[PDB]
Amino acid sequence: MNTNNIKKYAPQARNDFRDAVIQKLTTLGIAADKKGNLQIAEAETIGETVRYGQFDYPLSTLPRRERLVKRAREQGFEVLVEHCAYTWFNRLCAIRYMELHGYLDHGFRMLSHPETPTAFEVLDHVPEVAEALLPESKAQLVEMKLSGNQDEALYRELLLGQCHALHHAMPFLFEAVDDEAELLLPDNLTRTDSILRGLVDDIPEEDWEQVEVIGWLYQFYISEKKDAVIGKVVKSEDIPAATQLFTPNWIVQYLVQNSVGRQWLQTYPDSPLKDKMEYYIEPAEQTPEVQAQLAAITPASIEPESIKVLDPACGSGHILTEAYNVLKAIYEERGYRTRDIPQLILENNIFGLDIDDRAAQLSGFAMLMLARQDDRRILGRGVRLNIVSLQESKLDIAEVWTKLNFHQHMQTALANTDSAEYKLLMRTLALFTSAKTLGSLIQVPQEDEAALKAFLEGLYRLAVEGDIQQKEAAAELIPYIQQAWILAQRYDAVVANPPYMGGKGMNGDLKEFAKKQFPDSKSDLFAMFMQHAFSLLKENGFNAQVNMQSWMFLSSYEALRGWLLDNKTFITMAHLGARAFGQISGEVVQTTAWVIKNNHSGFYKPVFFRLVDDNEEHKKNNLLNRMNCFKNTLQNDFKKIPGSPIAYWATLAFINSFLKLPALGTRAVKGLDTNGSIDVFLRRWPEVSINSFDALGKGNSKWFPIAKGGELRKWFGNHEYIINYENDGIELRKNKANLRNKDMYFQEGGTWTVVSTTGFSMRYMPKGFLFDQGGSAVFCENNDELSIYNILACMNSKYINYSASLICPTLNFTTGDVRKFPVIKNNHLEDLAKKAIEISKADWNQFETSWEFSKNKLIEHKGNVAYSYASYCNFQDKLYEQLVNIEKNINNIIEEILGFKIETTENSELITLNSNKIYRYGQSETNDTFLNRHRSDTISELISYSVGCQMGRYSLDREGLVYAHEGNKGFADLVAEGAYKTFPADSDGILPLMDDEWFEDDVTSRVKEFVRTVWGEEHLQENLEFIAESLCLYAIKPKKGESALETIRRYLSTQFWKDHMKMYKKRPIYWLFSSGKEKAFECLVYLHRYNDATLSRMRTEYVVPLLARYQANIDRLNDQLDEASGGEATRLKRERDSLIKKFSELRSYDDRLRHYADMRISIDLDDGVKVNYGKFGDLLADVKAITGNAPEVI
Amino acid sequence: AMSNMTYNNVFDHAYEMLKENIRYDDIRDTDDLHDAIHMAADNAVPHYYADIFSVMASEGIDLEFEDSGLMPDTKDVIRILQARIYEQLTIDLWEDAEDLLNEYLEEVEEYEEDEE
Amino acid sequence: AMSNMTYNNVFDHAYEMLKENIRYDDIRDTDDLHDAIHMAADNAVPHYYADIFSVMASEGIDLEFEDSGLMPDTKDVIRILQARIYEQLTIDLWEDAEDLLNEYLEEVEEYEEDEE
After folding, report:
1. Contact assignment for B63 to C50 by CB distance below 8 Å
2. Which residues of A touch C62 (CB under 8 A)?
3. Is there a single domain that holds both residue A148 and residue A208?
4. Which of A235, A395, A584, C67 has CB atoms 3.0–4.6 Å from A589's, for a disulfide?
């Protein structure tokens, strides 16, 4: 088999049928506008026939065309077109299935010929099939066949007669004689090449033998419409498309079998049926009291007609078919007549309502064919089916009643108003008003359906015989009466799959309907269906459905879940994941299948089934032999938990631990929200003038630290952003920004990430930091019995992590969540907490990113560089061991206090520390290569600190950054005072990445001087070799025949600017100026030490001398090696060509630099590095990545 | 070699960044996330030479270059490889960005919480 | 995985081709063997995606071009990588060309192997 064949062919069938409908309607004179307006052509009565001016329509059929025009005017062109195309597709598929199985009376193949391709078996036996379906004019058909002209007309008439006979058999799928579709029948179907030919030669006959394939192609017929509808609010006309789904056989079997078998075992268990079906779970026993209660409430016995099945969402009808199978088994147990059993199942206990008309038609066809397979005589009997679709009712009942002449045959002088007959009529009429978009969510009482059954039998008698116009009125009125009766009657079992909506997919009218008629679970539609099914479910009934898993565990629906557990009990659970269920293709949706008992029955123990682990193909035999019974859990156990989520891994010890335990709900609060100026109101910490923000705290004119919440951090870190709040956030107030909890601003406490991706973790939140939305904060109460340290220690416990995972399965958290997690008190937890926070603070201040920067640990120790590296690694591992000991002690003491063992994964065994190698790296490549990467990174950080200290921000003799002002103002005074007395700083502020040691202040020479000064004169050679080896290990590719100084110079030229950019997250402060491919000119300038005259200064002091040197060098090399023919001659010629190119590039860069230099532009730090980088021009390096925009040239 | 990753891991990381940024930046239309997709593609490209070669040799990305503008004008080759990876990442990420922002539309639909 | 050959294998193959060329073409001048070394370097090319990637990931070859003229102007990474490999082979063969010249003229000295 191949469902892909029909999956591809069905949308194409839809397209071709739509094209045929449109072309036939145009040939009928009916046209559509580009605005959707309907155009009607008038056929003048020239003679016996009529004509719209181009097409001579038959006059006798003209009133039918006018009726079709009226239908179009009532509905619309496009809706009528899709209706006709869908109906014709269904009819063609039905006839194809009919002929393939040979159920037809004539026993021939209509759509094709079994032996001859592109031919019809009906053409072989025209006399026989004609005498079979159209007994009149058989001789005429035979002689016309032998007349020798086209017989495709005869084939069309034979098809029409067969369709009429089928309609006489079942009317829902086939139309009566003299219908509108007959005049609209495509002319292509009357041709040698036809859509029927394509569908009979394309789809394999061996694949056609399965009715599941028929349901599959029914679902595939609406695929592109589903593609188009998604992404916007689904229109009411498009709502039935959104209600199109498919379900796997095994889940449907499980639901229906569990419900009917629970009823059966309740009645009497000795019946051998429980051996017959597959998916059923035996209920267990807990106490004799509940068993006695259920034995009291259970019935002694039932009858097959007593049990009834409701299908609020009929769809294709798989659920109803499985119900048919189990009901047939029950009837066989009764021992009734073999051929009467299917008839009895058809007559009753089927019902089933649908939103779309043709879905109901196909479901009825499937039921009729299943009965036909059971018994071949059922087709002749022609028993009406209860599967109908909810049709909109907007007609005047008075006119129909006058046409019905009902007023005088059984009872103008309308007196049935006193008999409530008119009253029930207009009540039902009003109930269904604009109900097509509403669906099956209309509630009706049972007295109404009793009276409606009486009136329905009356209408049946009237339609059987009487006045023809009364017959028409009864036919018009009957669907409303029958649908009202079906929707108002109560049912024993309601098993169906609710439609799957989108967030705001439903119409605004549906939004209002849900808002007014359901105060609970109004955010969705599946809960709507299940609640209404509970309304339609009688006492002690079973409601089995496959809903989403969101409402099993969510902060919303807490009232819904509480009410349903207080008033109902659920017998069986089945929690499927993203792949176990086959209802939706893809992991986006995650569904759960449940069956709930109507009676509350107080507390009862359910059985549970886990399926998230694997997929459907595995989950079938996994469910056959489950391993997740979890019978120990009880209803009272489930209700005793915060928010009442259904927990599969619930421990009574755990839930008992939760109770009688304090849980904060006031100390934690929410932050402030900016109204959309975050790009301008929040910035990175080192971009602003550090002299104004970190220092000069009295002014407060600069920004303030902010918390947002990033990577999971346990104790300290994750704070590198600032926000402007001058004059109590005057700019934010002018921006109309929401400021909540203003009283806790710049206050000491703790902060936890609002929406994390790994788990729950809160870190100490220092005093004086502004607090923002995201990374929400907690604030201990004044004179509170619990210190903040103790609360942090309690929350860091893995028990709290497991509890958080349980209460909110989603990794996202909220204020309501932190209102719920428990907290305890101890007199040693806070000491471990403060030790841990101090350790984490040291670790986070170990690097340059934090403003509490501690000096490089390598230069702090004297000796060999390898000695310093070993000491640094010793410090790292000592920190790690102390941290893990403290964490284990905390977990052990909290476990001892709890008394119930708890287990977590990657919560306690994992710690957050940069010293820990596996945390900062992938952890999957533990081959000791990560140790080498650590070595290379450490050496690179040392080199970066050296180049920073060379250039004026850091002074090795002092502590921390020594210059942080803007505009190169206030630097000479520091020099005179003695800040840089040990190591001088380049006065011009320009670091040239020039050739090998040509300029006075080449970076390589300065770094060599630095490494010499730090570690003496005797070990400098081996230290330089060690640094070069570390660089060549992992940061840069190893090179052959390279000296240490060459290695460090090559690292500085390439893969140093990239590393510096990565370190500061695309916000560089050592800006780079480059010339291009030749790299003739390369310089580095400090952002905070940039002056407007620096451009011209460096243009006149670093470019023209280099240009002169290049010119002298090329002249000398041109003179050198004259008339030489050795290899060195070619080498020198290539070198001189290369530096000729470099000279040309340098000259162009000089021209551009002089053109930009006269402007003497100046930038402001508060603007941000992005806008300044864009403003500088094309002389800057790598602006596309930094500013996310292409460079410009002037 | 010392590195063994495919384009799939880099794409997953970039997709995670895109989700994080559509959450922080509060973008509700389909035109104010071009910066978001740009940064998501930019912060995903590997930096180590062996890593870039490994992802270059893996499936999911194409050796040919779609646009000339993305090509940097340098004598370095690993720069060009990073540019190619960046282009592939941004193309696929912008392809999935519509669905991601549509998902965030559910959250922005309500005024207190998506699920309320 | 799919390819494990490194740069020195290509070096060996190019060296052998240069030996064959100096043996066959009867070259007795550096400028005469310039075309020989050029063609020897030209032939030794991996000519395969995984092969070129593995050769690039190997050691003994610079990751940055020395000449801007060698730039092949095309939107294909494989062409650029092949150009770099060819340039490196050319440089190495030029560095080790005169020894084969000397050997060939010593085995060809006087009449064949030093006869007349």
Report:
1. no
2. 1039
3. yes
4. A584
What sign results for the dihedral spanned by CA atoms B26, B31, B32, B33? positive
Grouping H, G, I as helix, E, B as strand and the rest as coil, residue A948 is helix
Instruction: Tell me how many domains chain A contains.
Output: 6
**C57 contact B CB<8A:** yes
**Contacting subunits of C (3+ beta carbon pairs below 8 A):** A, B
DSSP lists the bridge partners of residue A992 as A1083
Domain that residue A467 falls in: 397-486
Which residues on neighbouring strands pair with residue A750, listed in sequence order? Answer: A764, A778
Residue bearing tokens 């029927």: A196
Residue of A nearest to C95 (CA): A1127
Decide which of A631, A649, A679 is a domain's last residue. A631
Residues A926 and A1029 in one domain: yes
CA C75 centroid distance within chain? 25
Chain C residue numbers touching A1125 (CB-CB < 8 A): 30-31
Task: List, in sequence order, the alpha helices (H) in A302-444.
Answer: 318-334, 340-347, 357-374, 378-381, 397-404, 406-409, 421-431
With an 8 Å Cβ cutoff, are C64 and A1125 in contact? no
In chain C the first and final C-alpha atoms are separated, in Å, by 56
- Tell me if A226 is assigned to some domain: no
Residue A380 sits in the same domain as residue A404? no
In a shared domain, residues A858 and A740: yes
Q: Which of residues 18-37 of B touch C (CB under 8 A)?
A: none
Closest CA to B21 of B41, B38, B36: B36
**Chain C neighbours among B 74-113 (CB < 8 Å)?**
75-78, 80-81, 84
Domains and CATH numbers, chain B: 6-106 (1.20.120.780)
Say which amino acid occupies A102.
G
List subunits contacting chain B, requiring 3 or more Cβ pairs under 8 Å: A, C
Do the domain assignments include residue A999?
Answer: yes
Partners of C68 on chain B (C-beta within 8 Å) are 75
Q: Which residue has the tokens 């709502």?
A: A239
**Is residue A633 a contact partner of residue A604, using CB atoms and an 8 Å limit?**
no
CA distance to A103, A110, A119, A195, C13, per residue, from A114 (Å): 15, 10, 9, 18, 67
Q: Which residues of chain A lie closer than 8 angstroms to B73, CB-CB? A: 1076-1077
Asked whether residue A834 is assigned to any structural domain, the reply reads yes
Helix (H), strand (E), coil (C) string for A692-743: HHCCCCCCCCCCEEECCCCCCCCCCCCCCEEECCHHHHHHHHHCCCECCCHH
Best residue in B3, B110, B115 for a mutation probing chain A (most A CBs within 10 Å): B115
CB contact under 8 A, A814 and B106: no
**Any CB–CB contact under 8 A between A1171 and chain B?**
no
Angle between helices A865-898 and A1020-1030 (to 10 degrees): 60
Of B1, B63, B75, Cβ closest to residue C64: B75
Cβ–Cβ contacts within 10 Å for residue A181, how many?
A: 17
Q: Are residues A8 and A116 in the same domain?
A: yes
Give the domain-ending residue among A1055, A1083, A1117. A1055
Chain B hits for C81, Cβ within 8 Å: 77
A510: domain CATH number is 3.40.50.150
Amino acid at A763: R
| Count of CA atoms in the C-beta half-sphere (13 A) of A990 | 22
Are A711 and A572 within one domain?
Answer: no
| Alpha carbons C57 and B55: distance in angstroms, whole number | 12
Residue C88 C-beta-side C-alpha neighbours within 13 Å = 21
A495: phi then psi, degrees, rounded to nearest 5: -125, 120
Rounded distance between C-alpha atoms, residue A1022 and residue A174, angstroms: 96
Strands (E), A101-195: none
| Locus of tokens 């046409």 | A403
Q: Does one domain contain both A441 and A420? A: yes
Do A200 and A282 belong to one domain? no
CA C116 – CA C111 distance, rounded (Å): 5
